[PDB]
Amino acid sequence: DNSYKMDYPEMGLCIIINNKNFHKSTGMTSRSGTDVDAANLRETFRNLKYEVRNKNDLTREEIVELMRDVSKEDHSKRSSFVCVLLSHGEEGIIFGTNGPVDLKKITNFFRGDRCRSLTGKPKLFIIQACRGTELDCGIETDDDMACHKIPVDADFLYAYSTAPGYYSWRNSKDGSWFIQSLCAMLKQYADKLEFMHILTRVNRKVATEFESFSFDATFHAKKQIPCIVSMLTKELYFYH
Amino acid sequence: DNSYKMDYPEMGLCIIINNKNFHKSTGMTSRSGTDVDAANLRETFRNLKYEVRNKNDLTREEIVELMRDVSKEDHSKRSSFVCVLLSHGEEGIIFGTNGPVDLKKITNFFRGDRCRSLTGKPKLFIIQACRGTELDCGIETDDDMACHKIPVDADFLYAYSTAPGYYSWRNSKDGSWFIQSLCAMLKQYADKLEFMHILTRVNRKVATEFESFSFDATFHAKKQIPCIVSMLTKELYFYH
Ligand SMILES: *CC(=O)[C@H](CC(=O)O)NC(=O)c1ccc(CNS(=O)(=O)c2ccc(O)c(C(=O)O)c2)cc1
Ligand SMILES: *CC(=O)[C@H](CC(=O)O)NC(=O)c1ccc(CNS(=O)(=O)c2ccc(O)c(C(=O)O)c2)cc1
């Protein structure tokens, strides 16, 4: 029908890569507050019946190896796959503790031709990381081959914390604006709303309720809009 | 609320930029079939009650001047804004008849801080153009500042014909896979489904029903998935 089959015996894995401390050589600062996000996500996805695996402070090599190994598991009995990345980033890039890795390298292991037991199933990548350094100042308000094949990039969804090219906000006490919002809206709406509609509420929450406050005028009164990228081919409900 | 107000006196403008013939220096071939796309879009959006303006074979300077001018119109009585680009492209780039221009230069005129009469209203950019040269081989199956402000990048939706880095297919006789599918799903579902759900059906239609056939193996048996990029903050229904 019009929605993904989510009544396989297992909902699937939820891999959370939580990079907090970075090698001195990289110059990257410790991501205070990321443990709050990681715990929030773990509970949130546990409640949606995902098999959560938390991984901390992985090098880029370990990230790639982890994703390769996970993609070689047999996911036949699982409805979907979720991977959450919490780290520093730039456009198209997430950081290991020792340096950058392209997101495409991580996601390619899950292409429809490379992970066959996830073919036709939604593969969700949730990314809390910057996509560049820009700050949003805001504004005051007939040959029939039907289904012989599917594209290898079909059935991926990326839930980015921020717009292309932009900074992504996090605070030590409450975690990141995006993950805070995402978890809240999943807690409230996962048993009732289709996923793109949940993510749209997340966009509104981040866009409307958060604004930076800083003694540094260059860092003050800033705003953020998350960015949903869907190559999904069906509606996704976490319930059946 | 949860959905955009779509009962202003006018649905809004639908600008269709149809680039078919290109200057010698571009090395770009004539985009046979694009007029089928242009006409299908004109009729589809007319039926949704948008004020359609078709523009043909614009240089990149004319595109930028056109967008600047349109963004300076008073859109107070309009619910939304639609811009469709039909041309050659690369990632982040659309071609004027005389060469490339960054999409960001076109969309920037419509930011929340730069086009005030569209602040808070959905701005949709529908893009039929390649995003690179890859071909998809497929696989057989405390502080209350709550508004206040919104991000300047809020309330944009991009409906890209294809995934990042990939080719985008066009048929010399029926038009492009994406635009044919988009017009068909709007015709069938605009009176019944929220817009992300209509685009999801477009994704499925393109992914499942189309597969290239070519005497050249390089171009044979290829697939395509469109790519929805939402920075919207509410649900969008074309009926009220
Ligand atoms: C650029 C990047 O990849 C990372 C992404 C990430 O770590 O999630 N972003 C940052 O490194 C980053 C670092 C620091 C801050 C600001 N944090 S703060 O100083 O605690 C702060 C100041 C003012 C203010 O209003 C807030 C707030 O949350 O509202 C936080 C942001 C991003
Ligand atoms: C690269 C780029 O930006 C543009 C985008 C665009 O024009 O919309 N793409 C192309 O330039 C382009 C050119 C030619 C074709 C193939 N067209 S065809 O020769 O009519 C054809 C051959 C085989 C085949 O199977 C089809 C089909 O529709 O199935 C069409 C594609 C893109």
From Swiss-Prot, chains A, B:
One of its GO terms (biological process) is response to wounding. The gene is CASP3. Its main location: cytoplasm. Heterotetramer that consists of two anti-parallel arranged heterodimers, each one formed by a 17 kDa (p17) and a 12 kDa (p12) subunit. Interacts with BIRC6/bruce. InterPro entries: Caspase-like_dom_sf, Caspase_cys_AS, Caspase_his_AS, Pept_C14, Pept_C14_caspase, Pept_C14_p10, Pept_C14_p20, Pept_C14A. This is Caspase-3. The lineage of its organism: Eukaryota, Metazoa, Chordata, Craniata, Vertebrata. GO terms for molecular function: aspartic-type endopeptidase activity; cyclin-dependent protein serine/threonine kinase inhibitor activity; cysteine-type endopeptidase activity; death receptor binding; enzyme activator activity; peptidase activity; phospholipase A2 activator activity; protease binding. CDD domains: CASc. It is found in: Cytoplasm. It comes from Homo sapiens.
